[PDB]
Every structure is written in C-alpha cells, then in structure tokens.
Amino acid sequence: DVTPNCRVALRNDSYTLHKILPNKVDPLVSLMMVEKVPDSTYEMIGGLDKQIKEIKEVIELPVKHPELFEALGIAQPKGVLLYGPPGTGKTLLARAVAHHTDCTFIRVSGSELVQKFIGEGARMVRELFVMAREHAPSIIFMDESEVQRTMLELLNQLDGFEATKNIKVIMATNRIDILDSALLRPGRIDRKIEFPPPNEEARLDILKIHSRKMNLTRGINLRKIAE
C-alpha cells in the first residue's frame, strides 16, 4: 500500500508513520497543465479529409490493429512530418489524433519551466522517455535547429534500441528544403504530409464550424464572404 512517490502523514515526536496522503500530481499532468494546448476533435476540422485518412494509416492503425502489419510482414511506422504554412491546422490535428486514439499528447519545446518535472539537469533529452514509457501509448509533438537535432536524438533511440512500442513522434514545420539531409534520409521519415492553404470550398466550412458560437442574423450568404 506504500507507493513510491506518494505523500504521507507523519507524527513529529518519534517520526512514526501516520496516514497516506491522497495524491499530488503526475510529472506530466503539471507539464501539459503549464503548456495548455488547445484540445481539438474531428468536429472542428475544416476540409482536411484526405489528410485525416493519411494520418490514420500511420497512427490510428498501429494502435487498434498492430497484428494487421504482421499480416504483411512489415515494420510499423514511427515518425510523422507535417509541413505547410502556419495556421493550417497542424496543432489541432496532432492534438486531435491523440485525443481520439487516447494517447498522451506530449509536445516538447525545449523550455526551462518544463525542465523541473523532467529532471534536475537532464543532460540528455532521453530522460523524457522515463515518463514516456510510463505513459507507454504516447505521442510526442514538436514545433518548427534544436528541434531538428532533438528529433534525430529521439529517432536514434527508437530505431530498434527502444523496445517499448506505441511511442511515435510528429514534427510540424514549414519549408522542407532547408532541414537536415540526415533527416532527409529516405529510411528515416515514414510519411510527410503537405497542408495547402484552403480553396474556396475549404474556406467555407471553417466559416461554418467557426460560425457556430456566434449569435447570427438570418440571411448571411457565407459563400460570398468566403469568396
């Protein structure tokens, strides 16, 4: 009943154990609490339906059906590159997919307030994998060169050296021709997905989903506004 990393009540005269103190925090619940990502869903996706089908093949399938790849005798994918201009739904997409397949959406940013829950110095980046294998079905997310070396340091571990599965990485950036050629090794990245700016069809539905919480007036002709 005595768990490691748990508070207790203690008497003061002889320092005798008194009672187990309920709980405190995970070192990751506080982390995502500090980060405060905008939690998303499929019901706020504006016209990215083929990209949904692309990301389900990489992420959704090797969770619900890992045996389906052993039906083909190929290894499961690990790394996702999402690219395109900013403001195109990268963060809500990566948050959404982990939200629907029930994974620990843990982005890294290389800050120093995040640092105190990872370690005292954390001379590597690899000390995050302690919490990651403790939340073993997890997804690591990254923004747009420290991210570029950081991703390589992750992928070198999860190249066969980490035995725990269900841990996948997603990097979101723009302008793919300026990143590393070692990151452009063809065996390294499993899938790269482009996010175009929306057309007249896909500017309408973001107005549609976004128009939900407003108190409107009847007769608007949203098509003209999208045009």
């Binding site: 002889s14 320092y15 005798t16 093949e57 399938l61 389906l68 790849f69 039906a71 083909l72 005798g73 190929i74 290894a75 994918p77 370690g119 110095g121 001379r123 590597m124 980046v125 690899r126 000390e127 994998f129 302690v130 060169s145 420290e146 070396r149 390589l152 340091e153 070198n156 190249d159 066969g160 050296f161 035995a163 050629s181 070692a182 090794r185 063809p186 065996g187 390294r188 499993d190 899938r191």
Partner: protein
C-alpha cells in the same frame, strides 16, 4: 557462500567423494561445534536480542547525512542535510569501509553520530544511456557485406569469447574501432547485431548530444560517462555521428568552438589516458570521416578503420530478398527491374520502398503487393 572453488572433476572421482566428505568433516565435527551455544549460556537469543540492542541504540528518526572526510579513530566530519556540518563519532556496527567522501550515511537524531550507511539509488543517467535488452536479429539480417563482419567479430566478439588465441600468440586486441561510409549504409545496423551478439554491458551515445549549454558540463559528462563505463565490467561504448560535434554550431552552447575544442581535449584524454583503462571497447561511426581531428584517429586511440562501400547489384538483390522475406509477394514483380532503378541506392532505400509499397497495399486493403505498388513506390520514395 564462496566456500570452496574446487569444482573441477566432472566424473565419479573419489576426490569428489573424499572432498565433499571432508566438507562433511568441517560440518559434522563442527555442527557438533554448533550445538553447545544456548545450551551453556542462553542469556539472550543473539538472533534478535543483540540485534534489537543495536536497534535500541539507533533511534527511529534516522537522519540521512553525507560524508566528506574520514578520521580513523571512529569520528569524522559529516555533512547535515541543512549544510551545518558536525564532528560526530562513528559506531561499531558501521562496518568501517563502505565509507567514501560523498557517501550517504545514517546519523543519530540526538547527537548525530554515524549510525549506518545507505545504499545509493544511483542516478537515472545510467539507465538513460544503458541499453537494456537485445535490439533485433543477428548478423544474418545484414547480408552482402561478409568481410568486415569478420573484422568486428575480430576486434570485439572473439577477444570476449575466446581468451586463448591472444595468449598463445602473446598479444592484446586492438583498441579502437571506427566505421565510416555513405549514410544509410548500415553503420548503426551493424551495431544492432553487435548488441544482439555480446553479453557485455552496452552503452550508446549520439555525437550530437555530447554538446551542452553550460561551461564544462560537456567534459564533465565525458568524465562521468567513462566513469560509468569503467565502474561496471567488460563494456562496449558506442558513439554515433561524432562529426556533428564539429559540423553544426548551435547557439545554446555559450562557449564557441573553443568549448567544443576543450570537450574534444577531454575525450582525447579519455581514449588514451595514462590511467589503467580496463575492459572498455570503443566502437564509433560517422559519415564525414574527413572533418574531425586526426589526433583522435591515430593508431593507439583508434586502431581499426572500417569503410562501408555502396552495395553492388548482386548484394542488392540479396537485400531485396532480406526485406521481402516474410511478406506476401505477388509474382507480378521482378526485382531485377527494381535493382537498377537507382544506380547508387542504399540499403535504407530498399526497405523504404518495401514498407511504402506495403502502405500502398493497405490503402487498398489487399494482402499481396503488386508491381504498380513498386512503380509508384519508387516515385514516392525516390523522386521528390
């Protein structure tokens, strides 16, 4: 417990009979010298009474202290958790040994006297840099190379498994092993099969993650790294992509290239220090072999220099046979057309085309992979 190391014989020998009956001599004679204790002077139990006499000496508020010096006549200056250090004495159940400067100890609550020592929960960094289990399959996964496999087994595996061949020769194994070639040629993939093969403790570090942001934390990380490498036993230290310490400059490092330089001085020590090194083998890999310091590449610090060429086409078809082994290959395909698609394709290119072709089959929910999956697979993988 370490009673008698003579376990040679390996048949029905009378020596084995008379020696085990002479252990029966030291145990029958002196089990009759075990009977008499509590028969003559009971006076206590001595199994818990004297034990609870120690446990009634030491109090339940066991403060945890830290050593910094030792004076031999069972008193020393120990550090409190506050920082205000004392000059307490040392008990007799302290087994005066496991006492080093910096060691966690157990003190009294009242007079803070040195009651006990504490087993150290180590540091997470060892578990971080320490590979736990075997990564993947054996050397038969590799295929086609077959020459430097004898070289890596030569410098690493054979000294471990056969400590006879060097002694009949009167010789020592070569020290340093380096691996270089084009990228994606299987440099890390060989070390995977090495980590399958060996029973020694295996460590792996990327040359990118050597660099730091504080001053000297790099060389300190080197010193504690080789400390961890030595303090176990026979060990293998792997270094991946050590050109990256010299190629890329990052603004997190406060010192410039003359901090990277001093890290290279510390590592340059830690390859060939005057100290007794021990049983630590070093395997390194890079692709820019021409960039780094030749002072580290000299014989004595690295003895064996191993190049990986590009795969020739008859080895390519072998690698195709490897990565298409357990898959449901429809007979539509011809691998020889897939061979000469790229004139200098790596082994990673083959596996990428195979896996992405399987992705194209799973887009259409089929079970076998057809030819057009490869036709658009080389367009997807290669041409962008």
């Amino acid at each position: 417990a370490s009673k008698l190391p003579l376990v040679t014989p390996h048949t029905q020998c009378r020596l084995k009979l008379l020696k085990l009956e002479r252990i029966k001599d030291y145990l029958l004679m002196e089990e009759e010298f075990i009977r008499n204790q509590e028969q003559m002077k009971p006076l206590e139990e001595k199994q818990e009474e004297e034990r609870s006499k120690v446990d009634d000496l030491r109090g339940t508020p066991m403060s945890v202290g830290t050593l910094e010096e030792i004076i031999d006549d069972n008193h020393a200056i120990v550090s409190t958790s506050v920082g205000s250090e004392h000059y307490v004495s040392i008990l007799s159940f302290v087994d005066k040994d496991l006492l080093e400067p910096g060691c966690s100890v157990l003190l009294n609550h009242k007079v803070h006297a040195v009651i006990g020592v504490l087993m150290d929960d180590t540091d997470p960094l060892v578990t971080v840099m320490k590979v736990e289990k075997a990564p993947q399959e054996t050397y038969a996964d590799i295929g086609g190379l077959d020459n430097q496999i004898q070289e890596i087994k030569e410098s690493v595996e054979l000294p471990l498994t056969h400590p006879e061949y060097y002694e009949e020769m009167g010789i020592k194994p070569p020290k340093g092993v380096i691996l270089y070639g084009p990228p994606g040629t299987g440099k890390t993939l060989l070390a995977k099969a090495v980590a399958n093969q060996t029973s020694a403790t295996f460590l792996r570090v990327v040359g990118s993650e050597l660099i730091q942001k504080y001053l000297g934390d790099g060389p300190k990380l080197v010193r504690e790294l080789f400390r961890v490498a030595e303090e176990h036993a026979p060990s293998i230290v792997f270094i991946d992509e050590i050109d990256a310490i010299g190629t890329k400059r990052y603004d997190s490092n406060s010192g410039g290239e003359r901090e990277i330089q001093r890290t290279m001085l510390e590592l340059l020590n830690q390859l060939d220090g005057f100290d007794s090194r021990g049983d630590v083998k070093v395997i390194m890999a890079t692709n820019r072999i021409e960039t780094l310091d030749p002072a580290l590449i000299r014989p004595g610090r690295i003895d064996r220099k191993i190049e990986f060429p590009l795969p020739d086409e008859k080895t390519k078809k072998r690698i195709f046979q490897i990565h298409t082994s357990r898959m449901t290959l429809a007979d539509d395909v011809t691998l020889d057309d897939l061979i000469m698609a790229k004139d200098d394709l790596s082994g990673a290119d083959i596996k990428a085309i195979c896996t992405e072709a399987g992705l194209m089959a799973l887009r259409e929910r089929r079970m076998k992979v057809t030819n057009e999956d490869f036709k658009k697979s080389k367009e997807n993988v290669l041409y962008k």
